[PDB]
Amino acid sequence: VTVDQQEILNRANEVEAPMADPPTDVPITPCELTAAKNAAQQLVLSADNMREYLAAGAKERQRLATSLRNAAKAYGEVDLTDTPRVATMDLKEAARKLETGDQGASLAHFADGWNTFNLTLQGDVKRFRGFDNWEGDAATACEASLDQQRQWILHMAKLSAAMAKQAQYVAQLHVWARREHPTYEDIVGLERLYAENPSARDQILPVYAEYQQRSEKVLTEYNNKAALEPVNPPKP
Ligand SMILES: [Ca+2]
């Protein structure tokens, strides 16, 4: 047993000092398609649960700072649930829905917040290092608890980056969908000429059928690829 009671108290303060607040940006659906809405909701649910778990992590660091203070005293005296999973068309309706909404701007801003948060957590792990002049079974036990919190923090940073990547992925998907889905204006132009020109109808119809088939393909990919896994953080 080597003891430096002052070191123990300094490290108690350092371990429970505030960490950076997680970001609070709400991700909004990129458009009016159900798949897009479900992706945005899944991120809302994941991010909220991450915040709940980050708050419990701060309690854990408070609990640890107290245990250090109790160890310092005693040398003197002798001297959380899972993230819910979100349950996951005519050509013109599909185009209208795709084209209505912010097109992924909020998703990118959500992603920047959580990416940065990941980096900030990674930069605030010095507080969990071993002791210079505290040795014994108590010091070793406490060094194990500190290491557990460091690992937990680094895991939460990984989850933060993964959730940010989920958001960027859905933003990318939406851009792809807009490139590949017929536009509303293109579709209605085709329909107006069909409507006004009886002699053009038999020959216009295969163009329209191809637009409808491309719409079905894009919507199928959108529905499949926008289904996000809930982020389930570990308990601290
Ligand atoms: Ca293309």
- CA–CA dist 74, 79 (Å, integer): 8
Place of tokens 């119809």: 205
**Ligand 1 centroid, distance to 144 Cα (angstroms):** 55
Determine contact, residues 95/184, Cβ cutoff 8 Å: yes
Place of tokens 């809405």: 37
- CA–CA dist 142, 130 (Å, integer): 9
- CA–CA dist 99, 58 (Å, integer): 42
The pair of three-digit structure tokens given for residue 153, joined into one six-digit string: 């923090």
Q: E strand or H helix at 139, and its extent?
A: helix 137-180
Residue by residue, what is the 3-state secondary structure of 148-199? HHHHHHHHHHHHHHHHHHHHHHHHHHHHHHHHHCCCHHHHHHHHHHHHHCHH
Nearest to residue 128, comparing CAs of 213, 16, 2, 212? Answer: 16
**Ligand 1 centroid, distance to 215 Cα (angstroms):** 13
**Ligand 1 centroid, distance to 170 Cα (angstroms):** 18
**Ligand 1 centroid, distance to 172 Cα (angstroms):** 14
Determine contact, residues 23/113, Cβ cutoff 8 Å: yes
Resolution to one decimal, Å: 1.8
**Ligand 1 centroid, distance to 18 Cα (angstroms):** 49
Non-local CB neighbours of 4 within 8 Å, separated by 6+ positions:
131, 132, 133, 134
Q: How far is CA 23 from the centre of its chain?
A: 10
| Residue at 152: amino acid letter | W
Compute the C-alpha angle 136/138/144, nearest 5°. 105
DSSP state for residue 136 in the 8-state scheme: S
**Ligand 1 centroid, distance to 46 Cα (angstroms):** 33
Nearest to residue 146, comparing CAs of 138, 159, 72, 21? Answer: 138
Q: Which residues pair with 2 in a beta bridge?
A: 135
Determine contact, residues 10/20, Cβ cutoff 8 Å: no
The pair of three-digit structure tokens given for residue 227, joined into one six-digit string: 């289904």
DSSP three-state, residue 2: strand
Q: Hey, CA dihedral for 110, 111, 114, 120, is it positive or negative?
A: negative
Q: 208 in the Ramachandran plot: left (φ > 0), alpha (ψ -120 to 50) or beta?
A: alpha
Q: Which residues pair with 135 in a beta bridge?
A: 2
- CA–CA dist 149, 153 (Å, integer): 6
**Ligand 1 centroid, distance to 176 Cα (angstroms):** 9
**Ligand 1 centroid, distance to 179 Cα (angstroms):** 6
Determine contact, residues 109/25, Cβ cutoff 8 Å: yes
**Ligand 1 centroid, distance to 199 Cα (angstroms):** 30
**Ligand 1 centroid, distance to 74 Cα (angstroms):** 71
Radius of gyration of the CA atoms of the chain, in A: 27
Non-local CB neighbours of 10 within 8 Å, separated by 6+ positions:
none
Technique used to solve these coordinates: X-ray
Non-local CB neighbours of 76 within 8 Å, separated by 6+ positions:
5
Q: Hey, CA dihedral for 171, 177, 180, 186, is it positive or negative?
A: negative
**Ligand 1 centroid, distance to 33 Cα (angstroms):** 21
